[PDB]
Design an enzyme around this catalytic site. Structure first.
Site, PDB file in Angstrom:
ATOM      1  N   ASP A   1     -12.775  -9.969  -1.741  1.00 57.92           N
ATOM      2  CA  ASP A   1     -11.711  -9.289  -0.994  1.00 57.92           C
ATOM      3  C   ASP A   1     -11.298  -8.026  -1.754  1.00 57.92           C
ATOM      4  OD1 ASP A   1      -9.678  -8.862   0.978  1.00 57.92           O
ATOM      5  OD2 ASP A   1      -8.434 -10.536   0.285  1.00 57.92           O
ATOM      6  N   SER A   2     -10.591  -7.134  -1.072  1.00 57.61           N
ATOM      7  CA  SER A   2      -9.865  -6.068  -1.756  1.00 57.61           C
ATOM      8  C   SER A   2      -8.547  -6.661  -2.272  1.00 57.61           C
ATOM      9  CB  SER A   2      -9.638  -4.868  -0.833  1.00 57.61           C
ATOM     10  OG  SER A   2      -8.949  -5.241   0.349  1.00 57.61           O
TER      11      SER A   2
ATOM     12  N   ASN B   1     -14.887   6.116 -14.302  1.00 59.08           N
ATOM     13  CA  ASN B   1     -13.869   5.534 -15.169  1.00 59.08           C
ATOM     14  C   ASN B   1     -12.578   6.381 -15.083  1.00 59.08           C
ATOM     15  OD1 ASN B   1     -12.201   4.833 -17.406  1.00 59.08           O
ATOM     16  ND2 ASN B   1     -13.982   3.785 -18.320  1.00 59.08           N
TER      17      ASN B   1
ATOM     18  N   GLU C   1     -15.237  15.066 -12.626  1.00 54.88           N
ATOM     19  CA  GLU C   1     -13.955  15.032 -11.938  1.00 54.88           C
ATOM     20  C   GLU C   1     -13.494  16.392 -11.405  1.00 54.88           C
ATOM     21  OE1 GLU C   1     -14.392  14.028 -15.111  1.00 54.88           O
ATOM     22  OE2 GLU C   1     -13.781  11.926 -15.318  1.00 54.88           O
TER      23      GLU C   1
ATOM     24  N   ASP D   1      -0.690   2.110   9.528  1.00 59.61           N
ATOM     25  CA  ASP D   1      -0.680   2.308   8.065  1.00 59.61           C
ATOM     26  C   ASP D   1      -1.709   3.364   7.670  1.00 59.61           C
ATOM     27  OD1 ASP D   1      -0.104   2.098   5.374  1.00 59.61           O
ATOM     28  OD2 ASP D   1      -0.965   0.085   5.098  1.00 59.61           O
TER      29      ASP D   1
ATOM     30  N   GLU E   1     -14.351  10.612  -9.584  1.00 57.06           N
ATOM     31  CA  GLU E   1     -14.006   9.611 -10.597  1.00 57.06           C
ATOM     32  C   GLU E   1     -14.985   8.444 -10.658  1.00 57.06           C
ATOM     33  OE1 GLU E   1     -12.052   9.738 -12.991  1.00 57.06           O
ATOM     34  OE2 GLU E   1     -10.129  10.711 -12.579  1.00 57.06           O
TER      35      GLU E   1
ATOM     36  N   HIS F   1       1.491   3.314   3.300  1.00 55.40           N
ATOM     37  CA  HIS F   1       2.265   2.611   2.256  1.00 55.40           C
ATOM     38  C   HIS F   1       1.991   3.161   0.847  1.00 55.40           C
ATOM     39  CE1 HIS F   1      -1.203  -0.268   1.674  1.00 55.40           C
ATOM     40  NE2 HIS F   1      -0.758  -0.222   0.428  1.00 55.40           N
TER      41      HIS F   1
ATOM     42  N   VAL G   1     -11.118   7.837 -18.479  1.00 55.87           N
ATOM     43  CA  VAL G   1     -11.942   8.703 -19.334  1.00 55.87           C
ATOM     44  C   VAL G   1     -12.423   9.916 -18.540  1.00 55.87           C
ATOM     45  CG1 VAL G   1     -14.073   8.839 -20.723  1.00 55.87           C
ATOM     46  CG2 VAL G   1     -12.740   6.690 -20.705  1.00 55.87           C
TER      47      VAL G   1
ATOM     48  N   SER H   1      -5.356  -0.363  -2.299  1.00 57.50           N
ATOM     49  CA  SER H   1      -4.569   0.206  -1.204  1.00 57.50           C
ATOM     50  C   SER H   1      -4.942   1.646  -0.905  1.00 57.50           C
ATOM     51  CB  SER H   1      -3.081   0.196  -1.580  1.00 57.50           C
ATOM     52  OG  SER H   1      -2.543  -1.098  -1.462  1.00 57.50           O
ATOM     53  N   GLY H   2      -5.143   1.941   0.374  1.00 59.14           N
ATOM     54  CA  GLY H   2      -5.429   3.304   0.810  1.00 59.14           C
ATOM     55  C   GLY H   2      -6.891   3.691   0.739  1.00 59.14           C
TER      56      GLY H   2
ATOM     57  N   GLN I   1      -4.449  -5.618  -4.585  1.00 59.14           N
ATOM     58  CA  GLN I   1      -3.516  -4.538  -4.944  1.00 59.14           C
ATOM     59  C   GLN I   1      -4.177  -3.507  -5.852  1.00 59.14           C
ATOM     60  OE1 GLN I   1      -2.420  -8.551  -5.113  1.00 59.14           O
ATOM     61  NE2 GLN I   1      -1.329  -7.129  -3.763  1.00 59.14           N
ATOM     62  N   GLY I   2      -3.843  -2.250  -5.601  1.00 58.58           N
ATOM     63  CA  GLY I   2      -4.474  -1.145  -6.301  1.00 58.58           C
ATOM     64  C   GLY I   2      -5.644  -0.573  -5.528  1.00 58.58           C
TER      65      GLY I   2
HETATM   66  N1  LIG Z   1      -6.002  -9.136   0.326  1.00 61.97           N
HETATM   67  C1  LIG Z   1      -6.130  -7.888   0.484  1.00 61.97           C
HETATM   68  N2  LIG Z   1      -7.256  -7.392   1.014  1.00 61.97           N
HETATM   69  C2  LIG Z   1      -5.006  -6.966   0.108  1.00 61.97           C
HETATM   70  C3  LIG Z   1      -3.786  -7.488  -0.327  1.00 61.97           C
HETATM   71  C4  LIG Z   1      -2.753  -6.616  -0.675  1.00 61.97           C
HETATM   72  C5  LIG Z   1      -2.933  -5.239  -0.590  1.00 61.97           C
HETATM   73  C6  LIG Z   1      -1.821  -4.328  -0.926  1.00 61.97           C
HETATM   74  N3  LIG Z   1      -0.776  -4.542  -0.236  1.00 61.97           N
HETATM   75  C7  LIG Z   1       0.415  -3.806  -0.317  1.00 61.97           C
HETATM   76  C8  LIG Z   1       0.942  -3.320   0.881  1.00 61.97           C
HETATM   77  C9  LIG Z   1       2.122  -2.582   0.872  1.00 61.97           C
HETATM   78  C10 LIG Z   1       2.764  -2.317  -0.338  1.00 61.97           C
HETATM   79 BR1  LIG Z   1       4.364  -1.295  -0.339  1.00 61.97          BR
HETATM   80  C11 LIG Z   1       2.241  -2.801  -1.539  1.00 61.97           C
HETATM   81  C12 LIG Z   1       1.057  -3.546  -1.531  1.00 61.97           C
HETATM   82  C13 LIG Z   1      -4.148  -4.711  -0.143  1.00 61.97           C
HETATM   83  C14 LIG Z   1      -5.175  -5.582   0.203  1.00 61.97           C
HETATM   84 CA   LIG Z   2     -12.768   9.858 -15.138  1.00 68.39          CA
END
Ligand SMILES: N=C(N)c1ccc(/C=N/c2ccc(Br)cc2)cc1
Ligand SMILES: [Ca+2]
Length: 223
Positions: A171-172, A54, A62, A84, A52, A40, A57, A177-178, A174-175
């Site tokens: 928890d993890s 910061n 890097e 995924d 990385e 995704h 900066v 991701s991956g 948004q951002g």
């Molecule tokens: N609670 C969590 N651990 C958690 C919640 C949401 C995400 C990101 N989720 C997405 C998945 C697909 C897309 Br496109 C955009 C965002 C990642 C982890």
């Molecule tokens: Ca940096």
């Protein structure tokens, strides 16, 4: 990462930031020329940023290396988020050192109860928005398949596992991701999804990397 801690500069040397003008996803360096991320996270025009801390900066450790190709898993379903996972190849090999290092693929799947390290530059709030500049870390256990399925009825496939805390608060997000879930020095998970972040009974859901080792190895060997 919600409810985590500041990792410390370059203490997670396999953590990468994917940048398309701005950070949009994490990833994990698995050898000098290849990164594993979430499907995704796919887009064109990816620059991989290694070493990385910061991300706003230039601090001196890097390496910025453009991707030459991305390979999304052939069976990735963007609706269900099954499979995924994606591979990103660097145009040139990263220079490996103590601060930029690959993470081992698993030899076997990790069990519920295993303590893991989850990391990223994602949102630090469960309500509202705050993005950290430095890398954040969270220690969290893998949850049982049964508790995972109970939390998310009808949504957990054999290619997913839950990790975190049913009580919420950690928890993890948004951002993130991956990005990596590393357990006993092996890459076991990729930050994939969850309902909101750090919500009670809604733990993080992660791509089950151990199911993809053959695909990863074969893909790398021919690309
Ligand atoms: N609670 C969590 N651990 C958690 C919640 C949401 C995400 C990101 N989720 C997405 C998945 C697909 C897309 Br496109 C955009 C965002 C990642 C982890
Ligand atoms: Ca940096």
């Amino acid at each position: 990462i919600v409810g985590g801690y500041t990792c410390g500069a370059n203490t997670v040397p396999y953590q990468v930031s994917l940048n398309s003008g701005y950070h949009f996803c994490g990833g994990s360096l698995i050898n000098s020329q290849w990164v594993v991320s979430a499907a995704h996270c796919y887009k064109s025009g990816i620059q991989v940023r290694l070493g990385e801390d910061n991300i706003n900066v230039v601090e001196g450790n890097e390496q910025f290396i453009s991707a030459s190709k991305s390979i999304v898993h052939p069976s990735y379903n963007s609706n269900t988020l099954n499979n995924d996972i994606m591979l990103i190849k660097l145009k040139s090999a990263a220079s490996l050192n103590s601060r930029v290092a690959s993470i081992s693929l698993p030899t076997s799947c990790a069990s519920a109860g295993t303590q893991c390290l989850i990391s990223g530059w994602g949102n630090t709030k469960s309500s509202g928005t705050s993005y950290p500049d430095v890398l954040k870390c969270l220690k969290a256990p893998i949850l049982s398949d049964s508790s995972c399925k109970s939390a998310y009825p009808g949504q957990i496939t054999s290619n997913m596992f839950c990790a975190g805390y049913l009580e919420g608060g950690k928890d993890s997000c948004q951002g993130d991701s991956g990005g990596p879930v590393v357990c006993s020095g092996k890459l076991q998970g990729i930050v994939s999804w969850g309902s909101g972040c750090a919500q009670k009974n809604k733990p993080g859901v992660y791509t089950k990397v151990c199911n993809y080792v053959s695909w990863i190895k074969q893909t790398i060997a021919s690309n």
